[PDB]
Write an enzyme that holds these catalytic residues in place. Structure first.
Site, short mmCIF file in Angstrom:
data_model
loop_
_atom_site.label_atom_id
_atom_site.label_comp_id
_atom_site.label_asym_id
_atom_site.label_seq_id
_atom_site.Cartn_x
_atom_site.Cartn_y
_atom_site.Cartn_z
N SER D 42 0.84 -1.23 0.00
CA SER D 42 0.00 0.00 0.00
C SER D 42 0.87 1.26 0.00
CB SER D 42 -0.92 -0.01 1.19
OG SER D 42 -0.19 -0.25 2.38
N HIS D 154 -3.07 -7.66 7.84
CA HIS D 154 -2.66 -8.76 6.98
C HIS D 154 -3.63 -9.93 6.98
CE1 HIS D 154 1.18 -7.15 5.71
NE2 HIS D 154 1.54 -6.93 6.95
N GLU D 163 3.25 -6.01 12.39
CA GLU D 163 4.38 -6.94 12.39
C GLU D 163 5.00 -7.02 13.77
OE1 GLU D 163 5.66 -5.42 7.94
OE2 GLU D 163 7.10 -5.20 9.57
N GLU D 204 5.45 -11.69 4.32
CA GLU D 204 6.81 -11.53 4.80
C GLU D 204 7.41 -12.83 5.33
OE1 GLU D 204 5.73 -7.42 4.22
OE2 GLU D 204 4.66 -9.21 4.91
N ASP D 241 5.62 -3.22 14.81
CA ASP D 241 5.24 -2.35 13.70
C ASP D 241 3.75 -2.09 13.88
OD1 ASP D 241 4.85 -0.88 11.43
OD2 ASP D 241 5.18 -2.53 10.03
N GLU D 283 7.38 0.98 15.42
CA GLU D 283 7.32 1.60 14.11
C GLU D 283 5.89 2.08 13.87
OE1 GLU D 283 8.46 -0.87 10.79
OE2 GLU D 283 6.85 -0.02 9.56
N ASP D 310 8.50 5.80 9.37
CA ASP D 310 8.21 5.15 8.09
C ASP D 310 7.10 5.84 7.29
OD1 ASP D 310 7.72 3.41 5.93
OD2 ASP D 310 6.70 1.93 7.18
N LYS D 335 13.12 3.29 2.80
CA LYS D 335 12.60 2.49 1.70
C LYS D 335 12.96 3.19 0.40
CE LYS D 335 8.79 0.65 4.39
NZ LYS D 335 7.32 0.68 4.60
N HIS D 363 12.35 -3.30 3.60
CA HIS D 363 11.91 -3.99 2.40
C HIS D 363 10.48 -3.59 2.08
CE1 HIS D 363 9.09 -6.82 4.36
NE2 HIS D 363 9.87 -6.60 5.40
N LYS D 386 15.51 -4.52 8.19
CA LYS D 386 14.19 -5.14 8.33
C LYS D 386 13.89 -5.77 6.98
CE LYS D 386 10.16 -2.81 8.77
NZ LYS D 386 8.95 -3.54 8.32
MG MG Z 1 1.92 0.75 3.25
MG MG Z 2 5.32 -0.11 8.20
#
Ligand code: MG
Ligand code: MG
Ligand code: MG
Ligand code: MG
Ligand code: MG
Ligand code: MG
Ligand code: MG
Ligand code: MG
Lengths: 423, 423, 423, 423
Positions: D42, D154, D163, D204, D241, D283, D310, D335, D363, D386
């Site tokens: 996303s 997820h 995460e 992941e 996360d 995060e 992030d 990223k 990643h 990560k």
């Molecule tokens: Mg996203």
């Molecule tokens: Mg994130």
């Protein structure tokens, strides 16, 4: 092959903070040489002319005009010639300019291209620059004349002798000569600091203290030589750069120490100096137009000492022949940027060799990190060099390059000590 | 790299049918140069010793011993040194020999290795030999002194002047100088054939007619110059090689034309010659031990003519300095095999340059197809060469190589005519 | 391949006439580098020591022992390692020495080999040194801090601050910043004459005037900036190098202007300076052992000016962490020979970056013609450099190299003006 | 030379079965490097946008027109530039696009060319891709943060954190850290199977169990760490996360586990978690726009734990400076495809280093077999990475490349264990 492919130029700063030209010549394969042009405090009436910008940028001393001249005109005018044909490329430049002073394109741009071409030719032959410019027999290391005490046109002081130089003529090798010079330099620094005098280096790395007169300066230098552990005359000798033009008013006479004198009285003063001190060389003892006085001085003391012509000749062969015929100045002073090209430099030094004149590769007031005059003083085998005091690494780069040259020679090298000053 | 890998040697014949040494040096790259050692007829004693075999083979002139010396000692003694370090290799050889005249290994073997090493170093730098040995400023083409009429120790004739030479000093270029020399040569051949005189070439390509005396010979040469279409003195000048040692009995005097004379009367004869003819140079006018007479002659006529020392100096610096100090013989004659190595040759020519002496690269009586002295006379910039008459292609190979040198220079070249004989 | 083949060192002279080491690491390809090791006027208690000879030769400052160390031990101890493994070779050297100060082998020999193998591991990849040491993002040109006026422990006059500096923060590019610096220099050179003082260059190219006090010096500098044609603060800032240790007697206070003061009094003096002048950075404001006073001064005036640690840190990470903890010295001063190897320099500058500290690549009092600190100040992207006044080409070589770096970058380059002094 | 010659592009599948771009920059030498562009699950409101085809082919996610943009525009627009000038080529691309988010040409057609040129500006210099981008001092292997348990956005589960990660901070080397991570992964797989749950890998490699509440997930992870043979906190830490933007309805609140909460309540929840478990990093704790709450949370716990944004920053320097000046979050994720080029990545990571923020190369959800982020996490020396769980070889390729890097460093390598989490 040694064919020129690219010629670039940029504007950099010299050792005094003024702009100068740097030329980079790239050959076809990748041989890429770079040479920077030194400058001088006095323009003169016969040297080649430096093409300065003029105005308010950099105090009117910008060299953007010479950079542009190299990048638009000289570049294609040499691109394609043969590097090893120094005389070809140098005559090409001299005709492309078209003037007897090279002032249309400036002596600095032309000299930069000449020198970078010579460096790229020496790099191409894979010889080192001194071996190329001098051939197979280039083996002599010169006696460094180290200007340690400045006076005259360099500081506010009673003395009007420009440079006081020492010369380690008694050393066994060149590295020991450099050591003796550095030791005399530091001894003089201590002697000066003792008497409450200034230890502020001038433009040559030499000191500029407020000494009484020429005799007091020479006595201070002798004290410094004694304090180092050597013997004046047997180990270390003395030398002068009078530059009498810097205090000679035309038609009246040489105002020396507040007493107007004729050429005769200046010769008597020089004779007294030569008597009371182990002087081996005096440079420009009188003005560059008082030819009769110069002939008189050469007759009088011109066999007890070396007579160097710095301004009376401008590394120009046309004035060199005229000074040869009239028996004056049994020595020349080779400054590469007073003639404009390497070729005319070599021709003038040849002409002065075949006339009984010793030569002396010399430096300018504004130098750079370029150490080519060392290679050139080894190649032509002058046996003398004048490149300042062991300080201000624009002066010490030359001595370092001479050390590397001696190491590269090895057993072949010979130090020209005391074989360059028979008198 | 310029590191020596192989050294070979073989025995060949020189231009006179006597054996001589040929040395071939091969570098690591593939650079493979060869050089043959000339040998003269007259040994001046001081010169380096030529190691001959002795016996019955080849009339006792075999050089198998020098070939063996090169193949067993000098080879490994230089294999591994650096070619461009001429002084290194030459000092190596001179110490390996160990004698003041190289007699243990012979001057011929040492000179062959020296010359082949120099040729391989010049080939390595990809420079041409003259450009290497002379640097960047090697541009002067010499004035060929063409020995056209032989007498004295070369044939049974009343004349005792050894060589009569012409010199085209008025030519615009070197090619025209060679043309004028060849034309004077053929004109003299015709003039001789007219008077029923012999047209048998000696060892120098010059003629050997039974003419009355020196004056008759010079008048015949002037007639030949006139018949070619030129003007004696303005276009073509004259020169002598007296070689007085060939008719000087020590303690008695110079037996000239059957009359014993002192040095004074010889000087008077030379003065008369100089007056009645456009002589520009005389070589060995008196014996090589009559130093006082030589000083007298240099004082008397030593400023109206060039005084060449062929035997009184032997290309040895130690005798050259002694002749410099006593004011004698303001010219040197550089024979490469009288000293034994290239390095000592360059040193002696330097020492004679810085003393006011003109030099003259010269040939030997027995030469080969080796054209090294042409490159050497261009490199050192002597402005004079003596390599025989335009005949007997051991003499003409030198002129052909000088033509190729001039063509390779191009616009840079300069003919040294009229700038090598100011008097 | 970037594997070391040879390591050889020689002894040369630095910009002050004292000996130093010069290393020449060749690679198995042909890459042949060379790096000379600088040395400062005065050292401290925590840096790596130089291995001087001691005795009478060169005044006891010979470096024959470090040359021999390189030629016998450091040579084979790295021959065979991987050039691009800077973290391998430097740890190899640091363990081969075995001491926390590199005393056994001297920091100068270690640093010479480190720097030379770095210049060969950048020459190998054909990258330029700044691009190698800094990566792909090395694009920032630093603000030159030009030491124009020297005082304190140099000219023994009534001034106590060591170096007064100007910083052209308002220039559009680097070349214009260098021009402005040179113009301020030449304007001050005339203001000195217009106030009856001396123009004797010190050791940094700066002037040595006998001015009244600190405030008078800053006023003279402001007058020179105005006379150059710029605006103080908006175009050209000011800077200080207090060097407090040169006047701090432990157990008592700082002796300034003839009065004993505490840390608080010195902080008030610095605040009064920050008041009436556009000071952007002060270097070593208090002694290197008065940590509590340093924390006080950092908390007091550490929001309005940069605080540079020259002696309180010696580019040692172990002291840098401690100074980070107690909240002192928001800026570091990176001298490459105070830690002995490149790797530890990189680690210390990383550690000071990740702590909120600006850095400043700096020079030593005795430099050479080596221009590595320019490449290193571009690579690490410090955005500041301190390499003397535009004179004495051991200082100007750095600026010339920065000019060449900017020209090679081109459109990518950015001048870090006004982005390096937010306060 | 490093000059681009040919640029190609094709369409391939990423790790999730969606198309992506693969560029193949070729150099004149023969250097041929390819690089595939990742894509996340996303996007947001400030990154660069991907140029998808749209329609019915491949579900509207084709990149057939980003492939065409490279073969018709970008190709000739970079063919001819200099590879080692990342700044040059990347500014060329950024201007060729002309939009503030690279929308006209897509943030995937450009990043591919950036990467594949950098993979040739490192392949050319024969350096490995990690030594180029980071210089000579690139030696630090990062702490792998392995996402072993997935929740939140997820799978259909009562978990709200996205995460859950483990970090082997106590390992002696990197290979032992990877071993510990894999062992914890398999231990958790066994605990999940033994407690009647599912072992379906997410995107992941982490597991997607249907567990109730955050605390139960951390308890499961702690039980797996205990069963592996290690001890939590001293050997293996924990990480989160939150990705709280994925459940923050603007103007209403953080609805989760059946309770609408303000930013203050979330800080207490995070504090309780930090107390009862050895968390080292969280995060996206609050939201993409709740700046004031972010500043509050940074004040409250922003010195006892690392704060990763992030999303609040998008690897954009412009938002990074704002978040610095307000001092919200102590860390950011780097990223590479949220900024569009390699240059801007390095600039943002530098800008965040000099602000006291630790970085973390991360990643995307859809990766490829391209292992560039490993080389980039060791080059910039981030000390954290990560890149997923040790499964799904698009995630394990990174760990394998880090193993190869650690083997190629040798003794130089250092594992950044427990030095990356001081709190
Ligand atoms: Mg996203
Ligand atoms: Mg994130
Ligand atoms: Mg002058
Ligand atoms: Mg002078
Ligand atoms: Mg003879
Ligand atoms: Mg003869
Ligand atoms: Mg200090
Ligand atoms: Mg300081």
């Amino acid at each position: 092959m040694p064919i020129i492919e690219q010629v670039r130029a940029r504007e950099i700063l010299d050792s005094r903070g003024n702009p100068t030209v740097e030329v980079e010549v790239a050959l076809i394969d990748g041989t890429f040489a770079r040479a920077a042009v030194p400058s001088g405090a006095s323009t003169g009436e016969h040297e080649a002319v430096e093409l300065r910008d003029g105005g308010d940028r950099y105090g009117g001393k910008g060299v953007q005009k010479a950079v542009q001249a190299v990048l638009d005109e000289i570049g294609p005018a040499v691109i394609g010639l043969n590097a090893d044909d120094q005389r070809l490329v140098d005559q090409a430049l001299v005709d492309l300019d078209g003037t007897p002073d090279k002032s249309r394109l400036g002596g600095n741009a032309i000299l930069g291209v000449s020198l970078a071409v010579a460096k790229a030719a020496a790099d191409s032959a894979e010889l080192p620059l001194f071996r190329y410019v001098g051939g197979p027999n280039a083996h002599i290391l010169p006696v460094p004349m180290m200007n340690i005490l400045n006076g005259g046109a360099h500081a506010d002081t009673a003395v009007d002798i420009q440079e006081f130089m020492v010369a380690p003529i008694g050393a066994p090798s060149f590295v020991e000569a450099l050591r003796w010079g550095a030791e005399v330099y530091h001894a003089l620094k201590s002697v000066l600091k003792k008497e409450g005098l200034s230890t502020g280096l001038g433009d040559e790395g030499g000191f500029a203290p407020d000494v009484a007169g020429t005799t007091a300066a020479l006595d201070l230098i002798s004290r410094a030589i004694e304090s180092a552990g050597l013997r004046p005359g047997a180990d270390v000798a003395l030398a002068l750069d009078a530059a009498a033009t810097e205090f000679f008013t035309d038609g009246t006479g040489y105002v020396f120490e507040g007493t107007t004198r004729t050429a005769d009285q200046m010769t008597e003063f020089y004779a007294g100096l030569l008597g009371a001190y182990p002087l081996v060389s005096i440079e420009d003892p009188l003005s560059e137009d008082d030819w009769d006085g110069w002939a008189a001085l050469t007759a009088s003391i011109g066999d007890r000492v070396q007579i160097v012509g710095d301004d009376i000749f401008v590394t120009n062969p046309e004035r060199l022949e005229e000074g040869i015929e009239r028996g004056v100045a049994n020595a020349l002073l080779v400054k590469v940027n007073q003639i404009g090209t390497l070729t005319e430099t070599l021709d003038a030094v040849t002409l002065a060799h075949h006339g009984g004149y010793r030569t002396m590769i010399s430096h300018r007031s504004g130098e750079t990190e370029d150490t080519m005059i060392a290679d050139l003083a080894v190649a032509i085998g002058s046996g003398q060099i004048k490149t300042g005091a062991p300080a201000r690494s624009e002066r010490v780069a030359k001595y370092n390059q001479l050390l590397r040259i001696e190491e590269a020679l090895g057993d072949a090298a010979r130090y020209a000590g005391d074989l360059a000053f028979p008198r």
